[PDB]
Amino acid sequence: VKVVVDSRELRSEVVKRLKLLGVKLEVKTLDVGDYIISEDVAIERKSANDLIQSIIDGGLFDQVKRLKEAYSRPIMIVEGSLYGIRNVHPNAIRGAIAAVTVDFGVPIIFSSTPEETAQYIFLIAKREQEE
């Protein structure tokens, strides 16, 4: 399977696992998105910490808007646990998650590690290729 990856992700552990999985990567510098699966499917990788920060600074929705305007079927993979991270009420996190997935209609898949993020990218790309 072939996946386009943004230059900023090139040396990540996600890319390492993708390569071990046999994925053929094409590097590009994208204005939006981290891993492109097709003309319509693009994946944005965001750490749990960065998700919370974007909620704190009120920048999450602008980011989702930008993703949707660039791709018809964008996907956000949130990496790392969202629990145990104080300084932010659980309802703020839950509320943001519900808004993105239900209102903006952008799937939010949760990954525990960069390796798991790669496994998700891989299985989605494979399905893309098969159909």
Q: Which residues are annotated as a binding site for Mn(2+)?
A: 34, 44-45
Measured from the CB atom, is 15 or 75 closer to a copy of itself?
75
For residue 65 the two structure tokens come to 């808007």
CB-CB contact of 30 with 75 (8 Å) = no
- The residues in 7-66 that bind a copy of itself, with binding defined as CB under 8 A, are 41
With CB under 8 A as the contact rule, the residue among 55, 75, 79, 80 that binds a copy of itself is 75
Burial of residue 7, with CB atoms counted within 10 A of its CB: 0-12 exposed, 13-18 middle, 19 or more buried:
exposed
For residue 10 the two structure tokens come to 């090139």
With CB under 8 A as the contact rule, the residue among 7, 56, 94, 129 that binds a copy of itself is 94
CA distance 90 to 27: 37
CA distance 18 to 76: 17
* Residue 90 within binding range of a copy of itself, rule CB under 8 A: yes
With CB under 8 A as the contact rule, the residue among 7, 24, 107, 129 that binds a copy of itself is 107
* Residue 98 within binding range of a copy of itself, rule CB under 8 A: yes
What Cα–Cα distance (Å) separates residue 46 from each residue in 5, 39, 53, 104? 14, 21, 11, 17
Task: Return residues touching a copy of itself (CB under 8 A).
Answer: 41, 73, 75, 83, 90-91, 94-95, 97-98, 101-103, 105, 107-110, 112, 116, 119-120, 123-124, 127
